[PDB]
Design a protein around this ligand. Structure first.
Ligand code: NWD
Ligand code: NWD
Ligand code: ZN
Ligand code: ZN
Ligand code: ZN
Lengths: 258, 258
């Protein structure tokens, strides 16, 4: 009866409260997705427990073992009832789990250390001085692997063969590498996260250019789950009553340090 | 079985071609949604007929009789098998029809005659010299009817009681009203249509401000349609292959005149 919610530690969606040691259950966490979970739970009339995905991944199918990892895996193998996180709606995932309508729009975007002479993906592709990479597991990497658009395939060819690895294990690892590399590393990441990091100290990064693509984050449930329909109606309700915009502002711009 | 597709005359989604005489059937029409129809038809593998919704409406539910009109009505009562149109995904609709994931994102925006002293919704609401309204039936009018945000309810209050009616039966009628009102009428409408008009001769209007909200267009099917799942996976496939971005560029900005 208590609904197990799988999610991921990724600011500002889900963060440990300063003092989580003294708190328990859901109280240990805070963020956009924590607020959204409370709201969905409330408008669906269920009680829930938040849990952080064990392997810290979003969800991909291993080619060899054909096994699903990450949050998607937790839903597929029945370890969780619902996932509320910055989880991208994709065709390959839609084939094994259900998604609500998107609660947030976004696209792949470019993060640079301020001053870097890059204005676009095309710019990145036509040069080698400035290295670039992505979160080495998720829909961003997958976007580039699969793309048939020339500029993106050109970038993918570079990135897959670059040594040392241009790929990073976490978003933070990616930001730090931008910040620390005197403008010789650029980072391709989802626009929402780019915009968030842009308003954080030391305020030395920026988003350049437009998004390379358009997609959305959705709340996921196991196929044929009994929560799917209600959860979906809830996201639509909360979007129309302005909540989702409220929450974006609270966690992005009301907190802005720049 | 040939699939009856319901849609609506709205540029650049569905428009009559210049030479539609001597053309027959699906060939009389061109537009973003026409190309969209064809591609979905190839990827779910069916044959279809394009038909323009008889009453020229998007879809709303008569409070009195509780009957659905517009394209939504045609799905609900079994007159059409699928709507492919700039149809907004909303809560009241998702309760009686099925939507695919969004094929396009957008928001309510303001259109002015060039030179009009308005920069935002607040500006509209704080004055009376300049009249304003919406498509008198659709998701936009409903957004204002329902809004609790002070500025939008302030506008709504004015709008509902305005004389003469500031509402219009078609986008075309709204734009003509802006163009001929010498700047005394501003028009609230979806960002996609606003962006398109701004790039067309006589090039005398402009989109001012940001979007007042965020949402999507989806393809709709009757609840429990066999087509439901297939079309959904098709929209995700097209978005990921970059086709949708291709169509948007072809129809919006390769067609610019200003
Ligand atoms: N949303 C993604 C995971 N994911 C996250 C980030 N990020 O945290 O900004 C990214 O830059 N790229 C990516 O694929 C998923 O669903 O795979
Ligand atoms: N997409 C809407 C209908 N609809 C369309 C336009 N338009 O064509 O830009 C508008 O300005 N307002 C509106 O409610 C829905 O489906 O009701
Ligand atoms: Zn800690
Ligand atoms: Zn609530
Ligand atoms: Zn195709």
């Amino acid at each position: 009866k208590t609904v197990v919610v799988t999610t991921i530690l990724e600011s500002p969606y889900v963060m440990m409260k300063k003092n989580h040691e003294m708190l328990e259950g859901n109280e240990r966490y805070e963020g956009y997705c924590v607020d959204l979970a409370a709201e969905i739970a409330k408008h669906c009339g269920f009680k829930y427990k938040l849990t952080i995905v064990g392997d810290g991944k979003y969800g991909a199918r291993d080619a060899d073992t054909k096994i699903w990892n990450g949050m998607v895996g937790e839903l597929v193998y029945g370890k969780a009832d619902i996932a509320i996180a910055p989880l991208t709606i994709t065709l390959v995932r839609e084939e094994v789990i259900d998604f609500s309508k998107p609660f947030m729009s976004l696209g792949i975007s470019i993060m640079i250390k301020k001053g870097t002479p890059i204005e676009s993906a095309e710019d990145l592709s036509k040069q080698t001085e400035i290295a670039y990479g992505t979160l080495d597991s998720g829909s961003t990497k997958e976007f580039f692997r699969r793309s048939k658009i020339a500029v993106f395939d050109k970038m993918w060819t570079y990135m897959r063969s670059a040594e040392p690895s241009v790929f990073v294990r976490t978003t933070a690892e990616g930001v730090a590498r931008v910040r620390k590399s005197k403008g010789k590393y650029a980072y391709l990441l989802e626009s929402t996260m780019n915009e968030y990091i842009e308003q954080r100290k030391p305020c030395d990064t920026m988003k350049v250019g437009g998004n390379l693509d358009s997609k959305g984050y959705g709340i996921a449930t196991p196929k044929g789950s009994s929560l799917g329909n209600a959860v979906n109606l809830a996201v639509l309700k909360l979007n129309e009553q302005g909540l989702l915009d409220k929450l974006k502002n609270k966690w992005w711009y009301d907190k802005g340090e720049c």
